[model samples]
Target: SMDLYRQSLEIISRYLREQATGAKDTKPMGRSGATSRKALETLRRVGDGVQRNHETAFQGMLRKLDIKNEDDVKSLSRVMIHVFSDGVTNWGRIVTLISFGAFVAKHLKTINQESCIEPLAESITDVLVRTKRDWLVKQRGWDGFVEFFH
Candidate 1:
């Protein structure tokens, strides 16, 4: 689920990047859209052979994390904690998970595979950086901050 979540994030990011490059108003059913669809279809074809692998991994993760309900905040947090446990050094991973969890919670079934969480994702990084620089340093102290990063 995390990997799919990560992939979805990456896909959205890539889409935004493409939009930022220009042709922002391109319709999704025109010639340009046909090309876009073809590109995506190619990617899908490449992924087709490996989707089962991803599914197996995801199902295994679900079992490991006991994520029976997507709406369960606790279950989502547990997965995030699991991610942190898997890689303690990656603070950004935890932050991203927390941000995504909050987004899902706020949206509450409104979000789907194509939904964009760009602002939420970007703002989470901003908050983390700002907090670390402005608040965490003073509150946690240099030693505490250093320890926390570990």
Candidate 2:
């Protein structure tokens, strides 16, 4: 389940980055190596944060539910894929990119512009919320989520 949560976070995180980059757009501009390197570092930090949170949350969920895996991390990969698939299939989530971008832009010192947040936030939130929620219920995946967070 932890792995499922992590993978979900990773996919959404990567997608949000791509959206911000607009590499999917018709007129795409590339970032300098230095800029990309910095972004990568930020990504690494964010990822670690997600993982740490997931681990703590997953453990709690299992304990509370009277479920404990003898090998906890073993099925993480499968879980991740299951959750991610559920996230990608839905369109309502695309709207969260607005909030996601806003959250990212707020921390982007050089790119601070009011115009950016709505779209970015929607995308980011869409991905993260879906990723977080997939673990909350069965129709989505994971059977149960550790926490309602992103």
Candidate 3:
């Protein structure tokens, strides 16, 4: 059941791996040998395009995961934001990101921390717990061990 989730995470990881080493895009450009100004401009556009393409591809892969719930979207977003901001590569950095996410998830209710991806990732367990609490309260009943999953 979690395999699909892992695969989605992998797509995110691949981009992050590229980003970590500043190797996100390696598409070669043709040297026109016609004008330096034009060549530089082309290079600039290429760079921007590569970044944009990476984002688009990442989003597309997430869509393919068939994730429907808002929580899933936000969870994936948390990972995406982390990679966009903190590039994943070394074990130390990855552990830091995951630990940060776990910490945040263990406390915060609202998961949309746009300005702080790493912190929010650290708090994912918290956000999920809060969501489960909200559900329990609204339903007027305990739904097993939702918090246990966290």
Candidate 4:
């Protein structure tokens, strides 16, 4: 399951890269006033198009997942580590990515429920932090556990 999610992320990254090639050619022409204005408009259009495409793709992915509650959120967070760790070939990157997810999830959860975009962000953090702390404490003792923040 996690492997599939990781593959999906890789697939999306590859697709986005392919789609970005058209914008690459337009990236070099923003020097003077008229050209700069034209270049900016082109850049904005391209960026907006890519953003819409990516958002649509993600929405499709979300619909496929059919996430209904907190359990689904926890499961998604667990699988996200696999996706996050894919290009990360080292322990440092692994930890960095996982910890980043935790940080973002925590901050996102702090937003008011009605105004928040992702309601499950907090639940995801709950699982991630608990799992991370559990292993750290078990493997490294209290000293290493304390060292996590430092």
- In order of appearance, the predictions have TM-scores of 0.29, 0.28, 0.22, 0.29
Tens digits of per-residue lDDT for model 4 on 1-150? 343223223322222232333332333422233433342343334434444555555455556545554455456655565554355243243233333333333333344222222334343334334435444335342233224323
In model 4, the runs with Cα more than 4 Å from the true position are 1-51, 88-119, 122-150
lDDT of 2: 0.38
TM-score computed on alpha carbons, candidate 1: 0.29
Query: Candidate 1, 126: how far from true, in Å?
Result: 13
Predicted structure 1: lDDT: 0.37
Better of 1 and 3 by TM-score: 1
lDDT of 2 by residue, 58-90 (tens): 445334433123232233334434445563543
* Per-residue lDDT of model 3, residues 1-150, tens digit only: 233223223322323333333344343322322232232233234433444545565345545544443455455655544453454333233233333332333222234333333333334333333333444345322122122211
Q: What is the lDDT of residue 131 in candidate 1?
A: 33
The C-alpha stretches of model 3 lying farther than 4 A from their native spots are 1-88, 109-150
Compose the digit string of candidate 1's lDDT tens values, residues 69-130. 43343335434444544533333343333334333323432334223335433333333443
Error of 2 at 52 (Å): 34
Error of 4 at 8 (Å): 25
What lDDT score belongs to each candidate, Candidate 1 first?
Answer: 0.37, 0.38, 0.35, 0.37
